[PDB]
Design an enzyme around this catalytic site. Sequence first.
Site, mmCIF file in Angstrom:
data_model
loop_
_atom_site.group_PDB
_atom_site.id
_atom_site.type_symbol
_atom_site.label_atom_id
_atom_site.label_comp_id
_atom_site.label_asym_id
_atom_site.label_seq_id
_atom_site.Cartn_x
_atom_site.Cartn_y
_atom_site.Cartn_z
ATOM 1 N N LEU A 296 0.810 -1.222 0.000
ATOM 2 C CA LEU A 296 0.000 0.000 0.000
ATOM 3 C C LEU A 296 0.853 1.287 0.000
ATOM 4 C CD1 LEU A 296 -2.846 -0.900 2.562
ATOM 5 C CD2 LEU A 296 -3.116 -0.714 0.083
ATOM 6 N N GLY A 297 2.047 1.206 0.560
ATOM 7 C CA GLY A 297 2.934 2.348 0.654
ATOM 8 C C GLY A 297 4.129 2.091 1.537
ATOM 9 N N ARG A 298 5.061 3.037 1.514
ATOM 10 C CA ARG A 298 6.273 3.011 2.314
ATOM 11 C C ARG A 298 6.561 4.418 2.774
ATOM 12 N NH1 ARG A 298 10.789 -0.196 -0.374
ATOM 13 N NH2 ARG A 298 11.698 1.759 -1.142
ATOM 14 N N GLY A 299 6.836 4.548 4.053
ATOM 15 C CA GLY A 299 7.193 5.824 4.650
ATOM 16 C C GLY A 299 8.615 5.772 5.145
ATOM 17 N N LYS A 300 9.012 6.781 5.936
ATOM 18 C CA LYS A 300 10.351 6.845 6.497
ATOM 19 C C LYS A 300 10.603 5.678 7.449
ATOM 20 C CE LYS A 300 10.743 11.970 6.210
ATOM 21 N NZ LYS A 300 10.885 13.219 7.003
ATOM 22 N N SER B 42 8.241 2.712 7.970
ATOM 23 C CA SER B 42 7.606 1.421 7.743
ATOM 24 C C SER B 42 7.182 1.212 6.312
ATOM 25 C CB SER B 42 6.390 1.271 8.659
ATOM 26 O OG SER B 42 5.358 2.178 8.303
ATOM 27 N N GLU B 43 6.851 -0.043 5.986
ATOM 28 C CA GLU B 43 6.270 -0.440 4.717
ATOM 29 C C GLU B 43 4.917 -1.038 5.087
ATOM 30 O OE1 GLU B 43 8.566 -3.251 2.169
ATOM 31 O OE2 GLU B 43 8.642 -1.559 0.763
ATOM 32 N N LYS C 134 1.925 -3.541 8.920
ATOM 33 C CA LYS C 134 2.929 -2.488 8.876
ATOM 34 C C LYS C 134 4.292 -3.070 9.311
ATOM 35 C CE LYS C 134 3.686 1.946 11.334
ATOM 36 N NZ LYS C 134 2.953 2.925 12.177
ATOM 37 N N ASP D 177 1.736 13.830 15.374
ATOM 38 C CA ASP D 177 1.867 13.727 13.934
ATOM 39 C C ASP D 177 0.481 13.763 13.247
ATOM 40 O OD1 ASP D 177 3.398 13.596 11.614
ATOM 41 O OD2 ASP D 177 3.542 11.453 11.613
#
Length: 327
Positions: free
Chosen positions: A43-47, A49-50, A66, A154
């Site tokens: 679904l996505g990747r951040g700083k 987690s994936e 996650k 956040d």
Amino acid sequence: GPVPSRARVYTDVNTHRPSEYWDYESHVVEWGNQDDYQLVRKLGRGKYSEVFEAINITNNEKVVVKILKPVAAAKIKREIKILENLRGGPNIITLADIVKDPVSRTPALVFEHVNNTDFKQLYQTLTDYDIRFYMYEILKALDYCHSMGIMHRDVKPHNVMIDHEHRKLRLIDWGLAEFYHPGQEYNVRVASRYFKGPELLVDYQMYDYSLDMWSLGCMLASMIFRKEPFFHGHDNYDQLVRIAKVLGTEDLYDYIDKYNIELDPRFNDILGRHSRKRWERFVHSENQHLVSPEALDFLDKLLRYDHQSRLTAREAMEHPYFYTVVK
Ligand SMILES: COc1ccc(C(F)(F)F)cc1-c1ccc(CN)cc1Cl
């Protein structure tokens, strides 16, 4: 040095609760079985987690997995503890399991699945009534976590999942959340640039739950005025200047004087002198359908430099802006 500050609400929650509640380092993680989950798609990747859509093959339900990255791995206990403490709270994402990813060799958090409507659709088509409805749903989540001695830190659109079809909202990504302890000095390198409170931008460390109320105000201003993001700073310094062009420099100086904060001298060459602007200045024919005297008054009470002067989540829920919302 700087004058200390403490929250005006929920100051004692981590005192009244036992040490097991907030001392996350002492928490023992009860690991589930990674083989219960089949990853379907990324679904996505951040700083930190994936994120993946997955199926729990034991009960045949859709879940979100996650997988934390190594940098995030060190502070996982804090996120897990916070998720477990808040589990069941209104509009708080539900942590369903914690497993160890075989490939990453890091913890993977398993959550309930929420079908999130795309940002564009929400940003462009939510009505005045929907904005008030969803703002109230976010306030339920914030008053719950604040009342539980936790500040999210956040709050931003990416962390607010909305399933518009079912009018369901969840506040997600508690990776930056912290337990609030009066007198504690916190890292100011939290929140995304456009949502950072003046306390962070002036390097004031003794902040509290009220930081989330500033972020909420930034989301509201962008939404009702059709100005995304509302305070569009080029960096953390220009971020404060963008705020000062709206709120004015006199109240900024009163704020830093109250807490005996010294502005970074690099502000001498960029800050200038600005009067406080009336909120009606941002109203035009393309956003008038989302604006009202109640909306502007509500916004005015969230977007204040002095973190101690902002509405709390519970006071915000009492505001006339929400009178139209079906309760
Ligand atoms: C600027 O964004 C918002 C601003 C206000 C609101 C609310 F008032 F309705 F609550 C929602 C979003 C939003 C919240 C989350 C998403 C997608 N994750 C999209 C949007 Cl538009």
